[PDB]
Symmetry: C3
């Protein structure tokens, strides 16, 4: 009931909620993630510092332009955390990567279910992807 960090399984840019798996870099050490409805549920009530980050890679040279948003929602049914990252159009000496980070203090009641939904608005949507192991959701409590 102290902290939790997990990584997204998704790679392709498709609108909808992301499935996650526990951070393998944190294995050798009390919040749960239901695999069916892809929700992280908080065990103990408290004020947590919740944060996610998102890195994107361009996979097709010379294609892809738009933006990609990532919203965390108190579930069930604005968003608590909101992160939209820009995808630059392709050119010589243009970036092939993009990143965004955001953290905030959220009050989460005991049993509150969290959900993160990925939205994209981009021409040639297939030209960008989520880098494996780089879009992370984490949180830890600061007040019992």
């Amino acid at each position: 009931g102290m902290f939790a960090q997990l990584v997204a399984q998704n790679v392709l840019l498709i609108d909808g909620p992301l499935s996650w798996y526990s951070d393998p870099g944190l294995a050798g050490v009390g919040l749960s993630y239901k695999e069916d409805t892809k929700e992280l549920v908080v065990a103990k009530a408290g004020v947590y510092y919740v944060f996610f980050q998102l890195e994107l890679r361009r996979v097709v040279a010379g294609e892809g332009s738009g933006s990609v948003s990532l919203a965390l929602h108190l579930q069930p049914l604005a968003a608590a955390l909101a992160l939209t990252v820009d995808l630059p159009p392709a050119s010589s000496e243009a970036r092939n990567s993009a990143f965004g980070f955001q953290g905030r203090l959220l009050h989460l009641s005991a049993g509150q279910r969290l959900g993160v939904h990925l939205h994209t608005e981009a021409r040639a949507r297939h030209a960008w992807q989520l880098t494996q192991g780089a879009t992370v959701l984490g949180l830890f409590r600061v007040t019992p």
Copy 2:
């Protein structure tokens, strides 16, 4: 007690000066006091108990008239009254306003976090400075300019 805090600015217009703050309504309704009090007259945020804290603020803008808007806006957190020799801020943040274009976004976001040593009663002020042409074209989006901290020592 946990001794935490988080506020969000009432300011929208890009006008140089200190920001007005109010407590996070999403945290209104927690038992702990939250060791940080916003005094309304001087637009300062005094810290209750001394200690070491992770302090962060974020900034988000929207372009509110299409076509214009170019430059940057900066957020500066100063321990007040100023008692340093360099005059630098304890926390700074600069986000840039992209000019209007086809296939160009109408948002800007920035986030920065550090560890501060704030003594008991220390007053903090957050100042906004813009170096932007046609700055009336962008504003701080409602509820997005946030400042928060929490203590990392008992």
Copy 3:
């Protein structure tokens, strides 16, 4: 308390490991815990093991008008690798746009994760750059920092 924060000495972008000094903004309490900085290896060693919230940041400024184009990367390495995990524990690349009409003249980046640090692990940061006019930018001094603190100290 088990926490630490470092400020980089470097301003000129050369590829290699950044050299640090303890953030004066916390001098009233020093570097409480057991975390110490080793100048010869430019690494910060971890005393008490456990899970930490780690973060670095990075701000660059164009210091020659009309020049400078590319991208710089910042990488945190955990030495030695624990369970083959430690290389690029935190990675962060930010681009430096070409100078042009109303173009960006500064660039910033932030990242923060929960890492499980072992007792005796060294933390190093490497700055790698890919720029056409490498000198036209540089690291704003005092702005590229690396800090951390513990949430739980289970071995």
